[PDB]
Amino acid sequence: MKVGQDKVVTIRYTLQVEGEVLDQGELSYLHGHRNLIPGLEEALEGREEGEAFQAHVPAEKAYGPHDPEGVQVVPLSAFPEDAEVVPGAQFYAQDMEGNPMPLTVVAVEGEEVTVDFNHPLAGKDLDFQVEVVKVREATPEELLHGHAHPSGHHH
C-alpha cells in the first residue's frame, strides 16, 4: 500500500551531507503529522512499499536555514566541573522548568563560550537514500497520540 496521510510508514535510510555519510538507520513514523522533515515526507508521498530511491532535500525543507540568533555567548561558569568545553562538544542547558536544550560549543575565550543552539543540520542540504519497508493504517490510539507506537528508530 502507498505512503499517504495517516499511514504509519517504516523507512530505511542513509543520510549524507556533502558526500559524508552522517547517519544510517530505520525508523517508523506517522505520515502527515509533522513527525518527519517536510522535504522527506514530500519525497515519500504516494510511494509504494518496496520502493527505494535517492532524494536531495534542501535545507529549507529539511532542518531549515541556520539561524544566527541561535548562536549565544554565555559564561564559562555555567559549564560544570571543568568539563571539555571545546569546539564540537555537545552540552544540555535547562530552562526554568527543566526542559533540556542542546547546544554545540563553537569557541572559548576568557570567561566566555560561544555556543550554538541550532540543529546540527540547520543550513545543510541533505542527500538521502530511502527504502519504504512497510506502510500500514494507523490505530485510533496512534492518531490520538499523534505518533506511531512505538515510534522512532528500530536501529
Binding site: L22, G25, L27, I37, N99, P100, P102, H119, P120
Partner: peptide, 11 residues
Amino acid sequence: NAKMLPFAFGA
C-alpha cells in the same frame, strides 16, 4: 523542526 525525525537534536 529540530525535534523531527530522522535526526533529532532536541530542544
